[PDB]
Design a protein around this motif. Structure first.
Motif, mmCIF file in Angstrom:
data_model
loop_
_atom_site.group_PDB
_atom_site.id
_atom_site.type_symbol
_atom_site.label_atom_id
_atom_site.label_comp_id
_atom_site.label_asym_id
_atom_site.label_seq_id
_atom_site.Cartn_x
_atom_site.Cartn_y
_atom_site.Cartn_z
ATOM 1 N N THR A 109 103.580 18.239 86.277
ATOM 2 C CA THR A 109 102.819 18.848 85.143
ATOM 3 C C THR A 109 104.223 18.429 84.080
ATOM 4 O OG1 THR A 109 103.025 20.863 83.384
ATOM 5 C CG2 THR A 109 104.976 20.759 85.032
ATOM 6 N N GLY A 112 104.536 21.153 80.604
ATOM 7 C CA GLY A 112 104.508 22.219 81.460
ATOM 8 C C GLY A 112 103.223 22.998 81.234
ATOM 9 N N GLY A 115 100.615 23.040 84.304
ATOM 10 C CA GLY A 115 102.188 23.971 85.216
ATOM 11 C C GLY A 115 102.278 25.378 85.343
ATOM 12 N N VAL A 116 102.455 25.699 83.702
ATOM 13 C CA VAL A 116 102.628 27.175 83.702
ATOM 14 C C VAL A 116 100.793 27.533 83.914
ATOM 15 C CG1 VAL A 116 101.865 28.731 81.460
ATOM 16 C CG2 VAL A 116 104.375 28.189 82.423
ATOM 17 N N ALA A 119 100.082 27.778 87.642
ATOM 18 C CA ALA A 119 100.857 29.020 88.202
ATOM 19 C C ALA A 119 100.390 30.970 88.350
ATOM 20 C CB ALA A 119 102.429 28.815 88.255
ATOM 21 N N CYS A 129 100.977 27.550 94.725
ATOM 22 C CA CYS A 129 101.414 26.939 93.584
ATOM 23 C C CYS A 129 102.139 26.208 93.772
ATOM 24 C CB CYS A 129 100.530 27.433 92.488
ATOM 25 S SG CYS A 129 100.421 25.999 91.097
ATOM 26 N N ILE A 131 104.260 22.623 91.701
ATOM 27 C CA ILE A 131 103.890 21.907 90.697
ATOM 28 C C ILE A 131 105.812 20.493 90.216
ATOM 29 C CG2 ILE A 131 104.498 21.953 88.207
ATOM 30 C CD1 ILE A 131 103.018 24.870 88.775
ATOM 31 N N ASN A 144 108.676 26.340 79.704
ATOM 32 C CA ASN A 144 108.336 26.130 81.133
ATOM 33 C C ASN A 144 108.579 26.738 81.927
ATOM 34 O OD1 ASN A 144 106.218 27.282 79.210
ATOM 35 N ND2 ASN A 144 105.564 25.347 78.303
ATOM 36 N N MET A 148 106.599 29.409 85.263
ATOM 37 C CA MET A 148 106.195 28.843 86.090
ATOM 38 C C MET A 148 107.091 29.704 87.645
ATOM 39 S SD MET A 148 105.857 24.744 85.714
ATOM 40 C CE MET A 148 106.572 23.929 84.043
ATOM 41 N N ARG A 149 108.494 29.187 87.693
ATOM 42 C CA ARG A 149 108.977 29.935 88.898
ATOM 43 C C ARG A 149 108.741 31.971 88.687
ATOM 44 N NH1 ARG A 149 114.474 25.670 88.538
ATOM 45 N NH2 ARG A 149 112.964 23.922 89.490
ATOM 46 N N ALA A 153 105.630 29.996 91.582
ATOM 47 C CA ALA A 153 105.204 28.858 91.789
ATOM 48 C C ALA A 153 106.840 27.907 92.172
ATOM 49 C CB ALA A 153 104.635 27.431 90.763
ATOM 50 N N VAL A 155 108.805 24.575 91.431
ATOM 51 C CA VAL A 155 108.821 23.881 90.775
ATOM 52 C C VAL A 155 109.411 22.498 91.518
ATOM 53 C CG1 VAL A 155 109.626 22.548 87.958
ATOM 54 C CG2 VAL A 155 108.157 25.002 89.099
#
Ligand SMILES: Cc1ncc(COP(=O)(O)O)c(C/N=C(\CN2CCc3ccccc32)C(=O)O)c1O
Ligand SMILES: Cc1ncc(COP(=O)(O)O)c(C/N=C(\CN2CCc3ccccc32)C(=O)O)c1O
Ligand SMILES: O=P(O)(O)OC[C@H](O)[C@H](O)N1CCc2ccccc21
Ligand SMILES: O=P(O)(O)OC[C@H](O)[C@H](O)N1CCc2ccccc21
Ligand SMILES: [Cs+]
Ligand SMILES: [Cs+]
Ligand SMILES: [Cs+]
Ligand SMILES: [Cs+]
Ligand SMILES: [Cs+]
Lengths: 393, 266, 393, 266
Positions: A109, A112, A115-116, A119, A129, A131, A144, A148-149, A153, A155
């Motif tokens: 990503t 992001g 990524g989002v 996730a 996931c 990333i 983002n 994500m976190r 996910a 990161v």
């Protein structure tokens, strides 16, 4: 040997280490199969409609084009769940991943937004996931990283090289090289090795299909031109695809001009690069005379990539689609304009598409034209970055 | 015909090949040339040499950092070919293989690249990101200029791939010890016996195992499995990395390692 | 004298200084007129559909209710342009404002979602927007302060009192007292003096109307219960309204329990307050024995208000609707659960509604029940607040 | 009948009323009682007294801070009624008007509130957030307990409102000088002549102008416009605020201001 054509004229291919070829062939097979599968299509359809929020609105601007003969509509991918077009194809790819018995996802990503999307799809459909995101983007697209976190996910900051998308791409591919048996690489754009450019387009094509239906209902005809920013080419090809055989419809891609093409600090390989081989594909690259890959630059993390998808290189070469560039400052002005006159906060990526559309209108205000800008996403992620810049002024 | 002659001499001596890899110009041109002479002197049967590339996708951090050290030294593809010519001048018979990424080959014309290779006396080229499926102009241009095109036989190779690698490749077959990227820490454990015999059946160029080979035991195992030898990259490069401030001790430790690795190939 | 009934049983009224009565009567008149106006309705409809993104999805959860006989759907007001249900009614009120020849908007905000909605509507429709927000909320809901300002709204921090919604409400009303001739007060909830509770409900009722149509299509019957958080009552009444005459359908409102009702640090006046007169209405209030208005508390800025709308007090008194409370920690758990198992980041406000629905399911897992939670908004604004809390643990 | 007697005495003396306002218990109970005695001594014709309320919606910062000062002193409605009784004990004939917010009246029963008012000798109550439309139980309970219910006549009053204020109110009509909230800086400029005559036509209780009156010229103008007098709140409270550390100088400056404001009413 492949089921589908890996190439778009000279561009495309499958330039990966031999180890990854079976993964790619398996993916292509799964895709061809799924595309013919009414149960896959219904499930994909269901997620798009009832989970993502499709169809997205086609919004007529009624302030920013005042005093001109330009009519401008925005395809509202900013309204999609997650906040960008990215969500469309990740939902299809996630279904494919499950269909292939994979339980893990690898994604890169920059903005992001992919990524989002990766996730959220993984949370929903039960995938683990991870990333890859360049350290620079972790910082300039921070909202983002939190998003994500929060969705479970992992990161992983990448500090190598330019510490941006390119470098995140590197790490994702290197990872997948050693994990393909368990992990599906959810590539985020219409680039990379076949079958990805083809799959990403087919899983984004609803954008242009909806747009067509919507504009016909509202206007009784097709657009004069559809306009979209080009990071790796997914939103643009998503917009373009259903319009390719409509020869009256102009297809316009906008590459990041960065600080100015003449500065070398830009992300516009299609018009200002040179064909090369990297990231699994033969495509326009920013590269040195020696053939080393150049680092790109853009204010927009999602466009900050020194290459571009093969179908765009193709569509350009034959003159079906036209590609231009918009600088940071041009994109920012368009960002401010939409915010303050239409009440919509666009992604800085999308703002590039809007900026060029605004240039089309401003340059020739008495030219009658019906334009569609793909507003690929919302600018919640750019909020602080934009603030910090404007404050500095 | 340096590979043909080498494998003939090694089989005659009932011996496996040890092939060390280094990035050309790491940590500088002078020291790298010294490194290479030391590798040969300590008993390298062949050499694999890398041209510094911006984005080495098949490489873990060890070799990633070898490329960067070279770039920090200002090392270009053109300076690499000057080195190769100098290396070939000193060593007329040792096989020299290049590890390339596609863009460096494709950049100023694929034909032009292989022609330069021949000009300097390179024997083979491995293009890491060009699978057999994309190799046509690469292997044709190689053969046109008397360069061996090298192909990787991965652990997940099917029969059709095996037969393709056997027909398309020359000099040696690259037998991949495991999936993933280069790295001395990540060792290949999966048995390769099935692949080696199939490659011998299809008359493939002699196989050398590579990826994660960092100890003499792995060299011997490779040989005992029926391979024609073993390739060590990251293990070699780690000694460069570890001894950057001690240039003399670097060559000392390199000589020891190569000598130990070559001994185990017998 | 009014055209419409200002009261819901004992609750409601028009408890403003005499100076503001003509403003309120003018507004009520404009509303009654607009409601009968097919051109107003078409324009409102157009904005909702083509600009805001209606209808919003009704999403079936298929992870969080595993192992139970609860079927849970979320009404996806988080997908609405701006990122909350708030946008629906501000678009109607903005049209009314123009209809009354007003060029300026005054609004209060807590979550910043109503603020963002008021700013975006004002950008779109050409109004000068100023927004009152408590200093505490400026900080804990910062992403929305950036969003508001980027759209050209003036944001005014309020440091008085609890420095939260109540205090922002104070300043907005005080302002309007001196500016009503030029400025329309876009109240953000179904509370305050008549006609606001009535107008806000009518401009939010599409939530429940869509939900009804959607659930019938998907399930062939009505929900067992619809569940919604109650800050001042707008999203809940928006959900409830079309279901009021459907007596089988349970209507459940969730007040912030804060740190615990027994702590006094909560925002639950409907069930734990006492009828009083303040903010233009006779309604349940948190007040001292002496009749001074108590400061409320919630983790959620959008629920952190020591009173509640009169129609909820009414619907409760007659036992049509039932009201409960959910604490900070309960709301947080629900926030985390949705993030990680459905891939949706809810507002902490909405999370209160979800938490109770999860309690309904968990408390009696073998009870067959079809539930709808109004997911009033997305939690992009809560991202840092949630992080800072979880980190501290 | 303190308002009736006052306006009779003032008209007899061809004089307008000056009515200062203060928040009860600002900045403390003792000093506030002294303040009030000084206001009377300096020539206050009537008093308007505020009960500290948590959220005074019709008030600008000056009086907002008067409420807060009182609360900082711990001043409750119950302590305010103790003060009122003490004030009435000392001054049997001066009209005393209360400025209330609805919740404080409604809290423990509207009837109970007005009964307490009467008990302590209050003459009128103004409920700032109760318009004529919501006033029924308020004005009924007031009259039941011989308290005058006060109503505001705003500049935007129509005829129906005027007639309502004239019939519903007693003691005095509150003539609002301008829209907005209380504040000495914000002065009302709009002519009120039209409203005053209509109120006289409908036999409304004598009108006192209030909001933004902070200078003797505004008092005289109010009187010359036909009003029965003028009310100053924020101007008075500002002298308290300004002299918090100088309690003796506070009363000195208050006496000067009230004396100057009362002079201009003649
Ligand atoms: C909102 C938004 N709009 C446009 C783009 C550009 O990408 P296209 O694929 O549509 O041209 C983005 C991009 N955002 C990201 C970067 N993506 C994902 C992986 C990748 C590789 C190469 C180029 C672009 C991408 C991202 O969110 O990761 C966007 O967010
Ligand atoms: C996402 C979201 N969900 C629920 C609520 C609660 O309000 P309801 O009116 O639906 O009960 C909010 C609230 N957010 C705000 C506060 N609003 C606006 C003015 C007001 C006065 C009294 C009580 C609540 C409110 C806001 O965004 O300003 C929300 O954002
Ligand atoms: O480095 P190790 O020991 O893992 O072995 C691989 C070695 O590096 C290799 O021979 N050579 C150098 C870089 C590279 C990339 C792809 C294929 C082969 C190589
Ligand atoms: O304070 P100024 O001089 O503007 O006049 C208003 C005065 O404060 C008033 O008589 N009294 C005190 C607070 C208040 C609130 C509403 C109506 C009347 C008052
Ligand atoms: Cs929709
Ligand atoms: Cs236009
Ligand atoms: Cs690009
Ligand atoms: Cs279930
Ligand atoms: Cs509340």
């Amino acid at each position: 040997t492949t089921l589908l054509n890996p190439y778009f004229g000279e561009f495309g291919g499958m330039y990966v280490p031999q180890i990854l070829m079976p993964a790619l062939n398996q993916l292509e097979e799964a895709f061809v199969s799924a595309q013919k599968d009414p149960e896959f299509q219904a499930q994909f359809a269901d997620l798009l409609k009832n989970y993502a929020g499709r169809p997205t609105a086609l919004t007529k601007c009624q302030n920013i084009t005042a005093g001109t003969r330009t009519t401008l509509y925005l395809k509202r991918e900013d309204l999609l769940h997650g906040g960008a077009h990215k969500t469309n194809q990740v939902l299809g790819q996630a279904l494919l991943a499950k269909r292939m018995g994979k339980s893990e996802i690898i994604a890169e990503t920059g903005a992001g937004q992919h990524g989002v999307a990766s996730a959220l799809a993984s949370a929903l459909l039960g995938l683990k996931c991870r990333i890859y995101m360049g350290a620079k983007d972790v910082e300039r697209q921070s909202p983002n990283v939190f998003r994500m976190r929060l969705m479970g996910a992992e990161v992983i900051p990448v500090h190598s090289g330019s510490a941006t998308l390119k470098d995140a791409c590197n790490e994702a591919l290197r990872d997948w090289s050693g994990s393909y048996e368990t992990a599906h690489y959810m590539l985020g754009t219409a680039a990379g090795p076949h079958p990805y450019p083809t799959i990403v387009r087919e899983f984004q094509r609803m954008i242009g299909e909806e747009t067509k239906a919507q504009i016909l209902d509202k206007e009784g005809r097709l657009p004069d031109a559809v306009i979209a920013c080009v990071g790796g080419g997914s939103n643009a090809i998503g917009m373009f695809a259903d319009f390719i055989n409509d020869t009256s419809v102009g297809l316009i891609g906008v590459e990041p001009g960065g600080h100015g093409i003449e500065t070398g600090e830009h992300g516009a390989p299609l018009k200002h690069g040179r064909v090369g081989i990297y990231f699994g594909m033969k495509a326009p690259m920013m590269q040195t005379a020696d053939g080393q890959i150049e680092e790109s630059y853009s204010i927009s993390a999602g466009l900050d990539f020194p290459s571009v998808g093969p179908q765009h290189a193709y569509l350009n070469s034959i003159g079906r689609a036209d590609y231009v560039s918009i600088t940071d400052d041009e994109a920012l002005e368009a960002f401010k304009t939409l915010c303050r006159h239409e009440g919509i906060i666009p992604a800085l990526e999308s703002s590039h598409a809007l900026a060029h559309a605004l240039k089309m209108m401003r340059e020739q205000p008495e030219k009658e034209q019906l334009l569609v800008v793909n507003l690929s996403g919302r600018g919640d992620k750019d909020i602080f970055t934009v603030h910090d810049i404007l404050k500095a002024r | 015909e340096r590979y043909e002659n080498l494998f003939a001499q090694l089989n005659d001596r009932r011996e496996g090949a040890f092939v060390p890899f280094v990035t050309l110009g790491d940590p500088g041109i002078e020291q790298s040339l010294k490194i290479i002479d030391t590798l040969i002197d300590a008993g390298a049967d062949a050499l694999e040499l890398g041209v510094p590339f911006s984005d080495p996708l098949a490489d873990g951090p060890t070799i990633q950092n070898a490329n960067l050290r070279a770039f920090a030294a200002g090392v270009t593809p053109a300076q690499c070919f000057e080195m190769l010519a100098i290396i070939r001048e000193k060593h007329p018979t040792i096989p020299i293989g290049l590890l390339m990424y596609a863009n460096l080959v494709f950049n100023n014309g694929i034909d032009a690249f292989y022609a330069r290779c021949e000009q300097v006396g390179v024997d083979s080229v491995l293009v890491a990101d060009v699978p057999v499926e994309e190799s046509a102009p690469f292997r044709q241009a190689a053969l046109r200029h008397n360069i061996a095109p090298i192909f990787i036989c991965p652990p997940n190779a099917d029969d059709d791939l095996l037969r393709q690698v056997a027909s398309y490749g020359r000099g040696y077959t690259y037998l991949l010890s495991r999936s993933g990227v280069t790295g001395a820490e990540n060792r290949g454990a999966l048995p390769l016996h099935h692949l080696i015999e199939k490659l011998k059946e299809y008359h493939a160029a002699p196989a050398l195992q590579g990826f994660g080979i960092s100890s003499p035991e792995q060299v011997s195992a490779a040989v005992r499995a029926g391979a024609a030898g073993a390739i060590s990259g990251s293990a070699i490069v780690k000694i460069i990395e570890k001894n950057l401030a001690s240039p003399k001790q670097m060559l000392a430790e390199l000589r020891s390692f190569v000598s130990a690795m070559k001994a185990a190939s017998r």
